[PDB]
Amino acid sequence: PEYQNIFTAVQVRAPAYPGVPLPKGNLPRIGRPIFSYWLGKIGDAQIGPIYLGLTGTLSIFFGLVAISIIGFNMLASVHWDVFQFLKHFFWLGLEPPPPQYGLRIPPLSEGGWWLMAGLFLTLSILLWWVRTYKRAEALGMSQHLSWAFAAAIFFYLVLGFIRPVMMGSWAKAVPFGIFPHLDWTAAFSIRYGNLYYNPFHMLSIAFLYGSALLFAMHGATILSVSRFGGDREIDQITHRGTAAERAALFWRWTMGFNVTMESIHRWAWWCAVLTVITAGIGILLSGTVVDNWYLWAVKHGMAPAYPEVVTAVNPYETA
Amino acid sequence: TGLTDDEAKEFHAIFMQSMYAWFGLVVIAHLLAWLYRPWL
Amino acid sequence: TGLTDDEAKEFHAIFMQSMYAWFGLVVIAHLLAWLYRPWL
Amino acid sequence: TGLTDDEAKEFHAIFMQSMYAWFGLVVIAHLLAWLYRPWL
Amino acid sequence: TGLTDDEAKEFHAIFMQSMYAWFGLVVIAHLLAWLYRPWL
Amino acid sequence: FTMNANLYKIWLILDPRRVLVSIVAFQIVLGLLIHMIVLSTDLNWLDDNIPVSYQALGKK
Amino acid sequence: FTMNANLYKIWLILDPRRVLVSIVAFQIVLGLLIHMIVLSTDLNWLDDNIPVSYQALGKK
Amino acid sequence: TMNANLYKIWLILDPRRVLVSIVAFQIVLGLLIHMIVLSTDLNWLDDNIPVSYQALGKK
Amino acid sequence: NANLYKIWLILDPRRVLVSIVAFQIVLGLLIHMIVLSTDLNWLDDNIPVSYQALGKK
Amino acid sequence: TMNANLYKIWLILDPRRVLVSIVAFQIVLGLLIHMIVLSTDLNWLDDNIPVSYQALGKK
Amino acid sequence: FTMNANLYKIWLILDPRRVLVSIVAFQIVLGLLIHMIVLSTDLNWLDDNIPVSYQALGKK
Amino acid sequence: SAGITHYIDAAQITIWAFWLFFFGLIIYLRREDKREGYPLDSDRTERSGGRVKVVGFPDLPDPKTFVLPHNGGTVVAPRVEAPVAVNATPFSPAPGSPLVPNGDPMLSGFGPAASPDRPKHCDLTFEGLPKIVPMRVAKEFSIAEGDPDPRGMTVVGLDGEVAGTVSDVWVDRSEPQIRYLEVEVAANKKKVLLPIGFSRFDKKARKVKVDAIKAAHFANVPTLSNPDQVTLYEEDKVCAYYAGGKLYATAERAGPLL
Amino acid sequence: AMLSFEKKYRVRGGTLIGGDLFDFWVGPFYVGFFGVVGFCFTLLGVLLIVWGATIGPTGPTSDLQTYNLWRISIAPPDLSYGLRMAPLTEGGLWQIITICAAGAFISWALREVEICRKLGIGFHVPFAFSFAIGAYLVLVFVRPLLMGAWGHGFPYGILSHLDWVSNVGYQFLHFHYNPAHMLAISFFFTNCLALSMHGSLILSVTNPQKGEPVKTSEHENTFFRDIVGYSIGALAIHRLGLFLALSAAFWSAVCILISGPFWTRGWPEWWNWWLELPLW
Numbered sequence A: 001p002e003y004q005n006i007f008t009a010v011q012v013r014a015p016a017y018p019g020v021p022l023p024k025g026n027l028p029r030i031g032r033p034i035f036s037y038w039l040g041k042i043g044d045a046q047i048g049p050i051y052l053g054l055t056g057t058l059s060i061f062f063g064l065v066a067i068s069i070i071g072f073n074m075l076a077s078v079h080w081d082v083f084q085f086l087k088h089f090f091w092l093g094l095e096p097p098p099p100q101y102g103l104r105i106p107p108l109s110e111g112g113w114w115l116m117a118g119l120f121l122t123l124s125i126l127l128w129w130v131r132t133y134k135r136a137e138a139l140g141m142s143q144h145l146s147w148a149f150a151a152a153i154f155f156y157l158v159l160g161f162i163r164p165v166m167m168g169s170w171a172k173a174v175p176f177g178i179f180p181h182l183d184w185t186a187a188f189s190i191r192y193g194n195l196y197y198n199p200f201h202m203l204s205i206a207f208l209y210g211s212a213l214l215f216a217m218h219g220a221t222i223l224s225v226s227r228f229g230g231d232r233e234i235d236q237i238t239h240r241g242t243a244a245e246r247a248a249l250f251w252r253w254t255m256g257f258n259v260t261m262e263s264i265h266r267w268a269w270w271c272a273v274l275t276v277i278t279a280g281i282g283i284l285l286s287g288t289v290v291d292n293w294y295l296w297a298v299k300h301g302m303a304p305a306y307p308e309v310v311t312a313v314n315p316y317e318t319a
Numbered sequence B, C, D, E: 001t002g003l004t005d006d007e008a009k010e011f012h013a014i015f016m017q018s019m020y021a022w023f024g025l026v027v028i029a030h031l032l033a034w035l036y037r038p039w040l
Numbered sequence F, G, K: 001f002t003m004n005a006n007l008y009k010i011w012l013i014l015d016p017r018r019v020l021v022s023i024v025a026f027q028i029v030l031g032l033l034i035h036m037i038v039l040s041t042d043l044n045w046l047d048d049n050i051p052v053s054y055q056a057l058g059k060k
Numbered sequence H, J: 001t002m003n004a005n006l007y008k009i010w011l012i013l014d015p016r017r018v019l020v021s022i023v024a025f026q027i028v029l030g031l032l033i034h035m036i037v038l039s040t041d042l043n044w045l046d047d048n049i050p051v052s053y054q055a056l057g058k059k
Numbered sequence I: 001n002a003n004l005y006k007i008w009l010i011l012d013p014r015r016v017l018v019s020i021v022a023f024q025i026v027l028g029l030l031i032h033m034i035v036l037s038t039d040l041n042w043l044d045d046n047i048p049v050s051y052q053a054l055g056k057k
Numbered sequence L: 001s002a003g004i005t006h007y008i009d010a011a012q013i014t015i016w017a018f019w020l021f022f023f024g025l026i027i028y029l030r031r032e033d034k035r036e037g038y039p040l041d042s043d044r045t046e047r048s049g050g051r052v053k054v055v056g057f058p059d060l061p062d063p064k065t066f067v068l069p070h071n072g073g074t075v076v077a078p079r080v081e082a083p084v085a086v087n088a089t090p091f092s093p094a095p096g097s098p099l100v101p102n103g104d105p106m107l108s109g110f111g112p113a114a115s116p117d118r119p120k121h122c123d124l125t126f127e128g129l130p131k132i133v134p135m136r137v138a139k140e141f142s143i144a145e146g147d148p149d150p151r152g153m154t155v156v157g158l159d160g161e162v163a164g165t166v167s168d169v170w171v172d173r174s175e176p177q178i179r180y181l182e183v184e185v186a187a188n189k190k191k192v193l194l195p196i197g198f199s200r201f202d203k204k205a206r207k208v209k210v211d212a213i214k215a216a217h218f219a220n221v222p223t224l225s226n227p228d229q230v231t232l233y234e235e236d237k238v239c240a241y242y243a244g245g246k247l248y249a250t251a252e253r254a255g256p257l258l
Numbered sequence M: 001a002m003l004s005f006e007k008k009y010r011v012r013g014g015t016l017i018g019g020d021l022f023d024f025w026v027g028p029f030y031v032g033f034f035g036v037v038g039f040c041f042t043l044l045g046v047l048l049i050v051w052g053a054t055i056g057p058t059g060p061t062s063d064l065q066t067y068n069l070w071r072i073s074i075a076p077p078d079l080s081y082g083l084r085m086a087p088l089t090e091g092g093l094w095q096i097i098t099i100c101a102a103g104a105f106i107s108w109a110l111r112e113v114e115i116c117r118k119l120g121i122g123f124h125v126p127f128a129f130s131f132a133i134g135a136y137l138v139l140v141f142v143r144p145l146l147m148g149a150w151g152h153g154f155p156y157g158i159l160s161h162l163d164w165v166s167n168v169g170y171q172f173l174h175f176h177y178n179p180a181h182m183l184a185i186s187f188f189f190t191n192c193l194a195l196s197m198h199g200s201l202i203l204s205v206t207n208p209q210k211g212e213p214v215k216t217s218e219h220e221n222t223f224f225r226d227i228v229g230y231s232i233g234a235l236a237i238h239r240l241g242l243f244l245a246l247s248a249a250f251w252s253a254v255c256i257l258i259s260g261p262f263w264t265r266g267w268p269e270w271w272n273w274w275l276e277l278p279l280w
């Protein structure tokens, strides 16, 4: 019956803290920070202000462009009739260029807007990684986001520049819509064996799990010992305490081994990065490498073998 | 900002020029090419 | 709230007027509209 | 807000001449295209 | 804001020169373009 | 405005900034909304009828 | 106004501002919804009939 | 007509909001035009003339 | 042009600057594309000759 | 014509941010140029020159 | 309102604001929801039938 | 893959790659995992696992140098630590047997209410002033517009019966979040910091029940050296107490139910 | 053995349903009333399964029967024996294992609790673990029941259990459109993003730039207050986390409890109620 740190019960407030000032080059921060009791009944109720440098704008701009394309072309589809646009929303989208112009600039119509819009969600995305490392260390901060961001941004390119363009196919590159995009993953699994057989996916999974696992534990753990300032990890990292005392101990008399209020945060950043890493891996192999991972698998002695209560015939042979 | 009026311009020129090394390097690249493969 | 009766009318009058400027502006829009391609 | 009547009227004036700057440059824009490629 | 009329005015011309510089640099871009392959 | 003359009162409860700005947006959007919903099915002067010759006849 | 007589006490329990800005939207939305829904199937005056076939007669 | 009583406008509306909001609107809107138009019949880039210098020169 | 100067007393010049620079970078990268995509793909399609078509073959 | 007035800019804009970032701006674009010319315009490598590098090589 | 005599007490346990505005949403949804159900199925009085198609006869 | 060697191609190489560098990085972590708390203490048991190495397979890493904030000493890791006391007696001499909290456990400072001796220097904010302070100096603050102000709420033992009340709710200059509540006890007429984390709000009756320690225990609550600010050392100190209550405040709790 | 500072927490008792007996440690693990049992199932599984590895498909002789994790897999009984003990060889064994595994996660789960008590801490951990526990039941129990078949669950194959999904997944064609699977997926993603941020940030403040101080929240709470504009807060992250994950699970849990016993058409269709709205 103890206040289980769910939603900050009683809150409090103080003026808008525009963060630690920045050196000679970091333009002025911008915004008149706001407060939201609700949002704040979970976290730092203050809102903003936010920075906006060159890449900051430069990137944001290159952002709300593809959107203004992948967004436009899409609406066009349902002949500028929003009503249905609203209906066939989750279905709509913008497809890539036809297998002909494999790499050539597709016409203003046939998959053109997609290559256009694409490149603008190729830069802005890559430019925003800059809007990190930049605003990152200019805080006296090292780089670990910027890092991961790549690992992720890596996989994104393994779904474009690096592979789709690597197989000469302005098609082999994912569409641009929830469902259709939801289909690309579907389509892919097929066109090439069946991904469940490409290790680097069955791998990249365990990770997307671990993260779904760990940052899910340490999120609790912290909480469990959040009374003992566990949440204050920062210092716990430096000057330990009963927090990291009670915590790690848990896992010690649980799964045996254990670690530190520091270490964990490591595996964290790792499993995560070691996810999109393995992602873009398979996705890169699958295409210009093995064509059917199911065959691959068994051909390596991997793929299992069950009895056979059902089998069919083969027209191409008897006929 | 972060500068004055003298040391400031010292840079204006110092770099302005250098850059032209490029524009020039680029132009040799754009002209030497044109001579090679005519693009249109 | 934050305002009193005295400027309550002033903001009231300045805004009300303009509103009718658009109502006349757009009514006219729908006029040339009907002129061009009649609808329903 | 953040100002008084004085600074206010001055802005509005110059701010207008700048708006008619557009309408004129854009209307003349439309017209030039209107002559070339007729829409409707 | 954060400046007076003096320092401000100066900025207005200096960048203005470089601004039209664009209108000019890009006008020569088109005019020589329209020359090459007429569009519309 | 036979009755909407006694409305003067409203302004204190209805903040000027909240009512002014917010309504200039609803218009800025619906503006496009309409032209889009109408441009979509009703009639499309853009691709509905001539002048549409230059596109086909003028093209090749 | 069988009940509208004593109904005045209503302003007292219901926030003037909360109820005023609320109908402001419900009406603003209900109406855009109704013209959206009716116009969809019932009578789509837009792409439905007359006066002339701007598309049909004009396009061709 | 409007201007005389419209200076009082900036007396409630910040100059920055109008200066900032308008630029954003004029350009995104400007863009959604050639854009929604370009994809429309009166396309100009690859639609018609001048003489098919591409079709002629290419082949 | 006369009265245009007063704008610098309310809006941070640096802002509009970096704002403009980013605006002309995407646009240009856009236009050259929005056109090279449709109008005249001056790069690959018409000139000078097909060293690849008439050559590779 | 306009060269003289501009030098006063350095005080207002930091050299490092503008200089090193451009260092990239210049490098990024030139990489994505061969990227566009190489991808579509012409493939100076496998284009013209006896593409029979493997037709006369694999043999 | 016979209950009233014995029904007044309800309001000491049920906050006026909590139940008043609350039911206001309930009435608003169910309603919208019902037309949605009936209309959509039973009889779609709107696009369903009579007096007769207007856009269909005027279109062709 | 389990038998030995079968197929042979390219991609299958790489699967070996990552699934190698993994077993490398895995160790990296292992080491980085060991920084603090290492090496182990007793021989109550040996290292469970495949290869029972001296002390952990990954040779303990080297010292790490933590450059603390302004006006702050420097910390490193690993960093040998001075053995502590064990105010308890082993229920059994058997390795792995529990240690009973001699005398009054509530303060015997053991397990359920034990703790380390963090630096005795109030952790400060960005520039200088100390982060966690009472709403006294935290005058530039204000209760969340809406949330019922806790100042004046009468605390109530887990036994139910009152146990003093409250005073200043120690906010923070770093994050506008309440971290402590001053509790002018009833018997001590003193001040005992209440760890919000342990304080359950009951905005209905102005109360703030804490199912952690009986009303009386608010007297044995480690007293604050200074009321205008609290140091890390004690930051852990006040907390750890109530903590014990979780397994002390009642004979019931500690002992099994079935 | 004990940690540098563990030696001072190993109080006596704190157990749940009894356990003041085996209330001791071994290596770095606390036993109690649950560390004990879980073990049982463990070998009467980890090894009981070995029997399976031994037996295989046809029999321990069939060329089909192998010893390669990649292939080894214990198959559930045929839908035939609905909600009844199947012949180990034909199904039961599978059930048996599963029988155990249930408790092995119910024990270790509870054991976690006793611990959570000893170390006088919060219990967010187990409570969390439970979801994860549950999602394993509502995916080999809650479902198969509303399918009248135990053998109607899934296998225990190193990768073999993969297909089991492949099928049951396609049983609705584009499983992808399942409303849940969409969200539940989304979470298992968002989680793998925030995580790839917190665990990053921290490891970027406590070990910041060269010749720099162990930064303070006075940075963190701004790090994103700059890039993205706003910062959920520090305490928060360790909330959003559990949230995401402890939801993602419970979601997916729904995701496959309804797929079948609550919906037979291809999901893509479910998405129709949308279209058919008397509006567009």
Ligand code: BCL
Residues within 6 Å of the ligand: E018, E025, E026, E027, E029, E030, E031, E033, I021, I024, I025, I026, I027, I028, I029, I032, I035, I042, I043, J009, J018, J022, J033
């Ligand atoms: C479309 C048919 C024509 C064609 C017609 C045109 C037309 C018409 C125009 C261009 C223009 C440009 N074209 Mg072209 N172009 C063609 C084929 C090409 C090809 C190609 C591989 O085939 C390439 C690589 C280019 C490349 C270019 C760019 C050099 C140039 C500017 C674009 C821009 O807006 O940047 C965005 C701008 C910027 C980042 C900054 C502006 C630069 C100013 C001068 C500096 C500001 C001063 C500041 C205070 C000091 C600091 C300097 C830096 C910021 C550090 N063209 C074909 C053959 N091209 C434009 C041009 O040349 O303008 C001069 C133009 O108007």
Ligand code: BCL
Residues within 6 Å of the ligand: C018, C022, C025, C026, C027, C029, C030, C033, F020, F021, F023, F024, F025, F027, F028, F029, F030, F031, F032, F035, F038, F045, H009, H013, H017, H018, H019, H022, H033
């Ligand atoms: C349908 C077939 C017709 C057609 C029929 C109509 C009809 C019918 C109407 C329009 C209307 C409009 N059409 Mg049309 N239109 C056609 C083709 C076009 C094309 C085209 C490229 O082909 C374009 C670009 C347009 C463009 C336009 C807009 C000019 C206009 C209003 C838009 C709006 O909602 O802003 C909205 C509003 C606001 C942002 C704010 C409210 C305005 C207030 C009064 C003053 C702002 C005050 C503020 C607080 C002070 C600060 C100042 C600044 C904001 C800082 N039409 C075709 C040929 N069009 C409407 C119109 O123009 O009415 C006059 C209209 O009624």
Ligand code: BCL
Residues within 6 Å of the ligand: D018, D019, D021, D022, D025, D026, D027, D029, D030, D031, D033, E040, H019, H022, H023, H024, H025, H026, H027, H028, H029, H030, H031, H034, H037, H044, I007, I016, I020, I031, I035
């Ligand atoms: C569609 C058929 C025609 C055509 C017909 C038209 C028509 C008709 C018009 C244009 C217009 C434009 N066309 Mg066109 N156009 C065609 C083909 C093209 C092609 C092409 C590659 O083929 C291109 C690149 C363009 C590009 C352009 C833009 C340069 C221009 C403005 C758009 C806009 O939204 O302004 C929006 C504006 C803004 C965001 C800025 C705000 C304006 C105010 C007054 C200034 C701000 C004040 C501030 C406080 C001071 C600080 C100064 C600086 C900002 C620092 N056109 C074809 C051939 N085009 C428009 C135009 O140029 O009008 C003059 C126009 O009306």
Ligand code: BCL
Residues within 6 Å of the ligand: B022, B025, B026, B027, B029, B030, B031, B033, J023, J024, J026, J027, J028, J029, J030, J031, J034, J037, J044
């Ligand atoms: C497309 C048809 C032609 C062709 C036409 C052209 C044309 C036309 C041009 C090029 C240019 C270049 N081409 Mg090409 N090119 C072709 C085929 C190739 C092939 C190939 C394998 O076939 C290659 C590898 C290249 C490669 C190159 C680059 C060397 C060069 C510059 C690109 C760049 O972005 O620099 C990135 C730039 C910079 C970083 C900035 C300037 C360098 C500064 C001085 C270094 C930084 C200094 C800093 C302050 C100090 C710190 C040090 C570190 C940076 C930290 N080309 C074909 C045959 N190529 C351009 C060129 O060479 O200009 C000279 C050019 O204009």
Ligand code: BCL
Residues within 6 Å of the ligand: G010, G014, G019, G034, K020, K023, K024, K025, K026, K027, K028, K029, K030, K031, K032, K035, K038, K039, K045
């Ligand atoms: C289905 C076949 C029929 C049909 C049969 C029916 C039937 C049968 C009924 C309706 C009803 C309604 N129909 Mg119908 N209706 C049809 C076609 C339509 C069409 C159409 C375009 O074709 C439309 C737009 C409507 C619209 C409507 C609504 C006006 C109406 C009430 C909704 C409600 O639940 O209140 C929501 C409620 C509330 C917000 C609050 C509760 C009300 C209380 C008593 C007052 C509030 C007190 C408050 C505390 C005081 C403060 C005052 C202000 C709030 C500040 N119908 C077809 C032709 N319709 C219902 C109706 O009108 O009942 C009167 C009804 O019973």
Ligand code: BCL
Residues within 6 Å of the ligand: A185, M101, M105, M131, M132, M133, M135, M136, M138, M139, M164, M165, M166, M167, M168, M169, M170, M174, M175, M176, M181, M184, M185, M188, M248, M249, M251, M252, M253, M254, M255, M256, M257
């Ligand atoms: C057919 C192929 C279909 C498909 C079919 C299915 C099917 C069929 C199912 C899922 C399920 C799920 N799918 Mg799907 N799915 C597809 C594509 C995807 C994609 C994708 C990017 O393409 C994603 C991200 C997902 C994501 C998801 C998850 C939301 C969801 C739950 C997984 C889980 O963690 O259970 C969490 C599970 C557990 C916690 C239990 C295991 C842990 C136990 C308690 C402890 C083990 C201890 C051990 C035995 C002891 C030894 C010690 C060792 C060291 C471990 N799917 C394709 C389209 N998907 C499943 C689901 O919804 O489950 C609810 C499900 O049944």
Ligand SMILES: CC[C@H]1c2cc3[nH]c4c(c3C)C(=O)[C@H](C(=O)OC)c4c3nc(cc4[nH]c(cc(n2)[C@@H]1C)c(C(C)=O)c4C)[C@@H](C)[C@@H]3CCC(=O)OC/C=C(\C)CCC[C@H](C)CCC[C@H](C)CCCC(C)C
Residues within 6 Å of the ligand: A059, A060, A061, A062, A063, A064, A067, A124, A125, A126, A128, A129, A132, A145, A146, A147, A148, A149, A150, A151, A152, A272, A273, A275, A276, M189, M190, M192, M193, M196, M197, M227, M228
């Ligand atoms: C294992 C690695 C995981 C990961 C890591 C990761 N993601 C990251 C990072 C890292 C390390 C970042 O550093 C970066 C980030 O958040 O930086 C602050 C990011 C990020 N991950 C993101 C998304 C994302 N990550 C995903 C996944 C993952 N990222 C992996 C699980 C997914 C998926 C598919 O599950 C998504 C969708 C972004 C939030 C952010 C990168 C943002 C970026 O590059 O933005 C560029 C700029 C724009 C898109 C412009 C936006 C335009 C306007 C600001 C908005 C206007 C409205 C909008 C257009 C709506 C339409 C309205 C119209 C009517 C106009």
Ligand SMILES: CC[C@H]1c2cc3[nH]c4c(c3C)C(=O)[C@H](C(=O)OC)c4c3nc(cc4[nH]c(cc(n2)[C@@H]1C)c(C(C)=O)c4C)[C@@H](C)[C@@H]3CCC(=O)OC/C=C(\C)CCC[C@H](C)CCC[C@H](C)CCCC(C)C
Residues within 6 Å of the ligand: A209, A210, A212, A213, A216, A217, A251, A254, A255, M038, M041, M042, M043, M044, M045, M046, M097, M098, M100, M101, M104, M105, M108, M109, M112, M125, M126, M128, M129, M130, M131, M132, M155, M156, M157, M158, M159, M161, M245, M246, M247, M248, M249
């Ligand atoms: C959203 C919740 C996430 C989560 C949370 C989570 N997991 C947890 C916890 C928490 C909070 C723990 O506290 C607990 C832990 O590690 O405690 C120290 C744990 C745990 N999560 C584990 C695994 C695990 N979690 C997974 C997922 C998740 N766990 C979710 C992503 C997954 C997968 C596949 O995604 C796995 C494999 C364990 C390592 C551990 C629980 C260990 C335990 O209680 O083991 C008991 C039994 C044994 C050691 C012996 C096994 C003997 C059995 C008789 C055999 C069972 C056979 C099995 C059913 C077949 C498997 C074959 C498959 C390949 C088909």
Ligand SMILES: CC(C)=CCC/C(C)=C/CC/C(C)=C/CC/C(C)=C/CC/C(C)=C/CC/C(C)=C/CC/C(C)=C/CC/C(C)=C/CC1=C(C)C(=O)c2ccccc2C1=O
Residues within 6 Å of the ligand: A210, A214, A217, A218, A219, A221, A222, A243, A244, A247, A248, A249, A251, A255, A256, A257, A258, A259, A260, A261, A264, A267, M042, M043, M046
């Ligand atoms: C032929 C042949 C060999 C046959 C085999 C025959 C055999 C061996 C038969 C025996 C079978 C048996 C009985 C096997 C069981 C043996 C046992 C007991 C194995 C241990 C079981 C077990 C659960 C092991 C752990 C499983 C693992 C590694 C899961 C990985 C998940 C993962 C990444 C966990 C992270 C672990 C860490 C680092 C935890 C520490 C940790 C965490 C998580 C915090 O949150 C935290 C917060 C604040 C401060 C500190 C900490 C902290 O230290």
Ligand SMILES: COC(C)(C)C/C=C/C(C)=C/C=C/C(C)=C/C=C/C(C)=C/C=C\C=C(C)\C=C\C=C(C)\C=C\C=C(C)\C=C\CC(C)(C)OC
Residues within 6 Å of the ligand: A067, A068, A070, A071, A072, A073, A075, A076, A115, A118, A119, A120, A121, A122, A156, A157, A159, A160, A161, A173, A174, A175, A176, A177, A178, A181, J035, J036, J039, J040
């Ligand atoms: C009309 O629109 C209005 C005005 C109403 C505004 C509304 C807009 C809306 C609602 C937009 C909505 C957009 C949505 C929902 C988008 C959804 C997108 C999804 C789900 C995308 C999913 C996956 C996308 C992927 C994987 C994209 C990959 C893109 C790549 C890899 C692009 C690569 C580009 C490259 C490499 C370019 C290189 C340059 C060239 C081509 C020249 O090199 C040769």
Ligand SMILES: [Ca+2]
Residues within 6 Å of the ligand: A095, A175, A180, A183
């Ligand atoms: Ca598709």
Ligand SMILES: [Ca+2]
Residues within 6 Å of the ligand: D039, D040, F044, F045, F046, F047, F048, F049, F050, F051, F052
């Ligand atoms: Ca027309």
Ligand SMILES: [Ca+2]
Residues within 6 Å of the ligand: C039, C040, G044, G045, G046, G048, G049, G050, G051
């Ligand atoms: Ca009509």
Ligand SMILES: [Ca+2]
Residues within 6 Å of the ligand: E039, E040, H043, H044, H045, H046, H047, H048, H049, H050
């Ligand atoms: Ca043309």
Ligand SMILES: [Ca+2]
Residues within 6 Å of the ligand: B040, I040, I041, I042, I043, I044, I045, I046, I047
């Ligand atoms: Ca060409």
Ligand SMILES: [Fe+3]
Residues within 6 Å of the ligand: A218, A222, A233, A265, M198, M199, M202, M238
């Ligand atoms: Fe953490």
